[PDB]
């Protein structure tokens, strides 16, 4: 019974919004589904303004966790019978699930879109049958760009309440899925704590745990320790596994030439008991294993990119790419099998050489779904990682990468704190919408729009209700002007009442309202 | 007298980093030129780092101002006599100046490449001859990529004291260039503090003192009164001015459907004139004027983009692009007469629009260096503007923009503090080496290198002394582990010694050393 305090409300984190849900049938079993968005209530006769929402069910006691609302759709699948319950089966048998309707209606998208970029395996929808808490999302280029937080302990800091808080507070300023990335104490109570209360996505890297199911010594792990790991987290919920199973004996030489060597946690794993025993990757071996146990939960799989780059010098190297080549070997294994499949991805990347890394992943795996880290386009700042990880992502997202894992300011220096966490999760969501305008995905640019016109109208307060973080936009107004009256004045202190240049277009355009520019 | 205050350090912004100076000799004259670089002193038998410096002289009293190291250029190429007094005059008699000499060496590069740059009008050489404090920079495409940080006061906040801190403060963090925008009060005094104290060129707008000087009614503004105003900043030594030419009566009505219509401060000034009298933009008619106070001086013209796009709704629209082609006319005539020039860019753009950006301005204004305002690639963050903007920065600095606006966190909030000018400064020298990265540039990846090569080594000290905020990364780090002995471990708190992929990677290469990766 940990020690949980609760996260600021919806309300204080987001002033004149409120939560909704859209309702919709799910005709086949006539299951209700409710659909979250949030709304903004604007001023000055503008329609309320209707956004996404991950934040999930508000002020639910921890200890209690979230209402179960897949139960009923889980159910009813159960008693008709399938040899597999993954979303990529049922969409090949040209099924719509309760799930795809929710993350059509969630993307404003048609069922049988989504149906079929599931079938076709360019979409995935991470939904473990035993995560009943789950509000359905979908990952895929043809959808809108997703973020994902990762949390969790290690040995050195850290405790299953600030771990639980962490989650809430990603989720609500816009993570799309988080990790339960964990390796210190408590592993699996931390997860379980996470898994019931999280209304998105959980996924893990199982190789951690089971690093620390044999006391931290690699030669010890095998694939029967692993498969035991794989059970465990499966039957708690966890919604897709990272797994290195690309990290083959013969790559691991490519790596010797490196500045950073190998920089993945679980791959540097991998590849310490490879060459322990000079034996193939257990995972890779085992591959098929994997995916009998992944059938019977629906866990997706993020195969890891455990060679992927660690320095600007190391970015598309023979042993990154060699690995990404085996990864669509196993992504096109797993699809024989209807397993949902989503690929990770770099690291450390030039801009220059981040498109060879889509039109490689793209063609190599066949248009599964991609899940970058990042990526960092120079070494030079550490602290700021965000930033230089802000702008890979956003650029890889713009080139069709699906899902882009964050970058917290701690990136190389220590674990990520709740501060650290919000800060990575609104730099990524800037990416995120950024790489949605420049596939001029559908509707994307009316946020945009929309907090334009309250700037050139001066409706302050709808301005910073519309923002990704409407109290640091206003408080940071308020520093120089935190009067009433200037959340109405037609300027800042950036220019003043006399310079305002939107003030300026404000009087040209009343003067042209009487007949036009043409007069003096 | 104001209370001039000092900030912190060299020594407390860069530990392990000395100022160190290279002596070159200007062969044509016998000058002896030192140009600034800094040095980071590194352990374990590496060579000591060389980066680039704009901190310019340090502990320097305010009141007494810099020494006027480019005195004797001046004053021997004066007693020579020379009938224009530009770079790019200098460059086309096949003259290689100091100022050539200073730039070519601070950028390891030949001294006739620098002079067949600004002679082409490819690269500027911001340097007005009566700023005999100026350390010489250069900007342009095929030169490491430029920042500016914008300072000033405005009629609503700040003070002399605060804005001489601000551009010793933006340069101590890597600003290449300053522009003093104030608004408010005591214009001509704060420059003239700013001028004598900076090291680093500065631009204005002189539009702006124009207006003041005619107490705010812009329908008093005319050429006679600007000329003044140029004359005035001229004789102080700004080293370039933006001049909204291309804001043409005409391109006026292409404006009025635009959702945030004219943002340009100066723009929004000179078209309130152009509808108020129904003529012709009264800098645009002056140009060939305007050239001949240029050439007197050496003061550079960033011709500006005052109807560059203020929302994404408005990115790439009609008038943008109108003004654009008479960027390239007023650039070309500019150089009839060997005036230096520069263009104005975008903006708010989301990605997709950015390389159309910089097609059409290095095609119609004939390669001219392009000095952006970002681009924002989203509106939906204020308070995030240096984030959303680094993204368009990095981009479009990729493609070959030479000079990036600095957005700061307070970009459509308030004024900029000092803590917001430090944001800003890093974010875009994150954005401008990205750049350099992108483009190949010689040696750029060095820096990248010889962090990464601290990183994997877990030389924590010279990692941090190697980055662009050393003190931030080396407090973050210390946030969760600060006893002296984390210096030197090979782990940090986000996995933990048994889970860190560096160490393993380590141990890795130290079992391979006997005779490599084939046995067990
Ligand atoms: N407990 C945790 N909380 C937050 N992020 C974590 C985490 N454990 C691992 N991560 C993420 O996983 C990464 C692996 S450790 C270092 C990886 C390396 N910097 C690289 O370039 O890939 C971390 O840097 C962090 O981004
Ligand atoms: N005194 C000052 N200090 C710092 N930046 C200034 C400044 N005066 C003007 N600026 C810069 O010039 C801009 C003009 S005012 C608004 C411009 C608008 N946001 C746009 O998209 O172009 C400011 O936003 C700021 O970026
Ligand atoms: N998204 C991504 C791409 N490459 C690595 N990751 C993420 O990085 C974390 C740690 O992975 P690893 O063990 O490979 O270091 C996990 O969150 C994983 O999804
Ligand atoms: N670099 C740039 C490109 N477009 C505008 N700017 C900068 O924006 C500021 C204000 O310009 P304006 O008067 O056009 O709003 C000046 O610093 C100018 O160089
Ligand atoms: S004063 Fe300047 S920064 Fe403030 S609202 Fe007006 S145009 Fe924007
Ligand atoms: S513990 Fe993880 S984050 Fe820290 S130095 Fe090692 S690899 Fe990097
Ligand atoms: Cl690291
Ligand atoms: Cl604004
Ligand atoms: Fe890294
Ligand atoms: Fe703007």
Not at 9 to 33: A, Q, Y
Not at 490 to 502: E, I, Q, R
């Given at each position: 019974?940990?020690?949980?305090?609760?996260?600021?409300?919806?309300?204080?984190?987001?002033?004149?919004?409120?939560?909704?849900?859209?309702?919709?049938?799910?005709?086949?079993?006539?299951?209700?589904?409710?659909?979250?968005?949030?709304?903004?209530?604007?001023?000055?006769?503008?329609?309320?303004?209707?956004?996404?929402?991950?934040?999930?069910?508000?002020?639910?006691?921890?200890?209690?966790?979230?209402?179960?609302?897949?139960?009923?759709?889980?159910?009813?699948?159960?008693?008709?019978?399938?040899?597999?319950?993954?979303?990529?089966?049922?969409?090949?048998?040209?099924?719509?699930?309760?799930?795809?309707?929710?993350?059509?209606?969630?993307?404003?998208?048609?069922?049988?879109?989504?149906?079929?970029?599931?079938?076709?395996?360019?979409?995935?929808?991470?939904?473990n049958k035993k995560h009943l808490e789950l509000e359905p999302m979908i990952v895929g280029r043809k959808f809108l760009v997703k973020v994902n937080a990762n949390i969790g302990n290690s040995a050195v800091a850290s405790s299953i309440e600030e771990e639980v808080y962490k989650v809430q507070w990603a989720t609500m300023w816009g993570a799309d899925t988080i990790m339960d990335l964990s390796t210190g104490r408590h592993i699996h109570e931390t997860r379980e704590?996470?898994?019931?209360?999280?209304?998105?996505?959980?996924?893990?890297?199982?190789?951690?745990?089971?690093?620390?199911?044999?006391?931290?010594?690699?030669?010890?792990?095998?694939?029967?320790?692993?498969?035991?790991?794989?059970?465990?987290?499966?039957?708690?919920?966890?919604?897709?596994?990272?797994?290195?199973?690309?990290?083959?004996?013969?790559?691991?030489?490519?790596?010797?030439?490196?500045?950073?060597?190998?920089?993945?946690?679980?791959?540097?794993?991998?590849?310490?008991?490879?060459?322990?025993?000079?034996?193939?990757?257990?995972?890779?071996?085992?591959?098929?294993?994997?995916?009998?146990?992944?059938?019977?939960?629906?866990?997706?799989?993020?195969?890891?990119?455990?060679?992927?780059?660690?320095?600007?010098?190391?970015?598309?190297?023979?042993?990154?790419?060699?690995?990404?080549?085996?990864?669509?070997?196993?992504?096109?294994?797993?699809?024989?099998?209807?397993?949902?499949?989503?690929?990770?991805?770099?690291?450390?990347?030039?801009?220059?050489?981040?498109?060879?890394?889509?039109?490689?992943?793209?063609?190599?795996?066949?248009?599964?779904?991609?899940?970058?880290?990042?990526?960092?386009?120079?070494?030079?700042?550490?602290?700021?990682?965000?930033?230089?990880?802000?702008?890979?992502?956003?650029?890889?997202?713009?080139?069709?990468?699906?899902?882009?894992?964050?970058?917290?300011?701690?990136?190389?220096?220590?674990?990520?704190?709740?501060?650290?966490?919000?800060?990575?999760?609104?730099?990524?969501?800037?990416?995120?919408?950024?790489?949605?305008?420049?596939?001029?995905?559908?509707?994307?640019?009316?946020?945009?729009?929309?907090?334009?016109?309250?700037?050139?109208?001066?409706?302050?307060?709808?301005?910073?209700?519309?923002?990704?973080?409407?109290?640091?936009?206003?408080?940071?107004?308020?520093?120089?002007?935190?009067?009433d009256g200037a959340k109405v004045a037609h300027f800042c202190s950036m220019c003043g009442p006399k310079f305002c240049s939107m003030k300026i277009t404000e009087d040209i355009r009343k003067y042209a309202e009487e007949n036009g520019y043409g007069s003096a």
């Amino acid at each position: 019974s940990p020690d949980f305090q609760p996260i600021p409300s919806f309300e204080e984190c987001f002033p004149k919004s409120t939560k909704e849900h859209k309702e919709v049938v799910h005709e086949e079993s006539g299951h209700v589904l409710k659909v979250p968005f949030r709304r903004v209530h604007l001023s000055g006769g503008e329609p309320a303004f209707d956004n996404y929402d991950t934040s999930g069910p508000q002020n639910v006691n921890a200890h209690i966790g979230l209402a179960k609302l897949r139960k009923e759709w889980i159910d009813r699948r159960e008693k008709l019978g399938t040899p597999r319950y993954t979303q990529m089966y049922y969409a090949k048998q040209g099924i719509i699930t309760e799930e795809m309707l929710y993350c059509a209606t969630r993307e404003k998208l048609d069922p049988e879109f989504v149906r079929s970029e599931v079938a076709r395996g360019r979409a995935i929808i991470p939904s473990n049958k035993k995560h009943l808490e789950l509000e359905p999302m979908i990952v895929g280029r043809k959808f809108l760009v997703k973020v994902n937080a990762n949390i969790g302990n290690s040995a050195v800091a850290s405790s299953i309440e600030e771990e639980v808080y962490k989650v809430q507070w990603a989720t609500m300023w816009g993570a799309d899925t988080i990790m339960d990335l964990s390796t210190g104490r408590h592993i699996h109570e931390t997860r379980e704590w996470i898994l019931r209360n999280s209304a998105v996505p959980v996924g893990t890297v199982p190789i951690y745990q089971a690093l620390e199911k044999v006391d931290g010594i690699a030669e010890n792990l095998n694939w029967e320790v692993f498969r035991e790991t794989l059970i465990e987290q499966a039957e708690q919920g966890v919604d897709y596994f990272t797994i290195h199973a690309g990290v083959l004996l013969r790559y691991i030489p490519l790596t010797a030439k490196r500045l950073t060597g190998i920089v993945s946690r679980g791959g540097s794993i991998h590849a310490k008991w490879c060459l322990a025993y000079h034996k193939e990757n257990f995972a890779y071996e085992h591959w098929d294993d994997i995916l009998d146990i992944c059938n019977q939960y629906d866990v997706a799989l993020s195969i890891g990119d455990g060679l992927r780059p660690g320095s600007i010098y190391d970015a598309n190297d023979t042993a990154q790419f060699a690995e990404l080549l085996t990864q669509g070997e196993l992504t096109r294994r797993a699809w024989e099998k209807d397993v949902q499949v989503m690929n990770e991805g770099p690291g450390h990347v030039p801009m220059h050489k981040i498109p060879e890394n889509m039109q490689k992943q793209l063609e190599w795996c066949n248009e599964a779904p991609f899940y970058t880290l990042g990526p960092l386009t120079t070494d030079i700042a550490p602290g700021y990682d965000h930033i230089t990880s802000a702008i890979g992502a956003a650029n890889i997202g713009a080139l069709g990468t699906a899902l882009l894992c964050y970058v917290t300011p701690k990136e190389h220096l220590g674990l990520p704190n709740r501060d650290d966490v919000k800060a990575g999760v609104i730099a990524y969501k800037i990416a995120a919408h950024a790489a949605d305008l420049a596939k001029q995905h559908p509707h994307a640019q009316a946020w945009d729009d929309a907090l334009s016109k309250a700037r050139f109208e001066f409706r302050w307060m709808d301005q910073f209700a519309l923002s990704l973080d409407p109290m640091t936009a206003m408080s940071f107004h308020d520093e120089t002007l935190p009067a009433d009256g200037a959340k109405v004045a037609h300027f800042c202190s950036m220019c003043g009442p006399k310079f305002c240049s939107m003030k300026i277009t404000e009087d040209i355009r009343k003067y042209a309202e009487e007949n036009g520019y043409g007069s003096a």
